[PDB]
């Protein structure tokens, strides 16, 4: 568990490391077949581990943990949570630049 | 097997239900954590019933069929094509009436 970005494995995965997180979190929703995913999360990725524990990044792969997506009414790809103490805390969808995404982050860190 | 409304149950399927058909194809793309597929979906399913073999109706779910959706450029929820010998020759996204989608099959049936 040394990585602050990391793919969520499955069900218990997610209790552990994002319900159960004891930093703040980032949740990206994302697929294989959505385009804007592919700029989104890379992006999102290299800001989260410049922060270097502040933050993590759990990446969902909505094909491969379809349970997930339908808890946390996820509607459309890319979707990414701000999650703290297991609450759901911000939310966007679809794409964002560097500069909206460090306003995301810092909202979410303080 | 008897009915113009099916699932899609792998890569092969797809070959010889939609590619190598002889009728023409609506091919529905939808997802379970999807609310307006939950609409789109029956309703669609009831109008092509009612052409009695004149258009066939393939449902893909996208998160048991990435693939699909990779090669025909799916990039959300509620998805239909319209095929004809192999070929995509309509497309719409989202929820349509009834009115709506009775123009759509009036267009690709003739």
């Known amino acids: 568990h040394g990585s ?12 552990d490391r994002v319900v159960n997180s004891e930093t703040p979190v980032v949740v990206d929703f994302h697929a294989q077949w959505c385009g804007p995913c592919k700029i989104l999360g890379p992006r999102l990725e290299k800001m989260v581990a410049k922060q270097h524990g502040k933050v993590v990044m759990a990446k969902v792969d909505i094909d491969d943990h379809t349970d997930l997506a339908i808890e946390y009414e996820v509607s459309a790809v890319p979707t990414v949570l701000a999650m703290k103490n297991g609450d759901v805390v911000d939310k966007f969808v679809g794409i964002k630049d560097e ?6 982050l810092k909202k979410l860190i303080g």
């Open 4 to 15: 602050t970005t990391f793919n969520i494995q499955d069900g218990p995965d997610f209790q």
């Open 99 to 104: 500069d909206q995404l460090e306003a995301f």
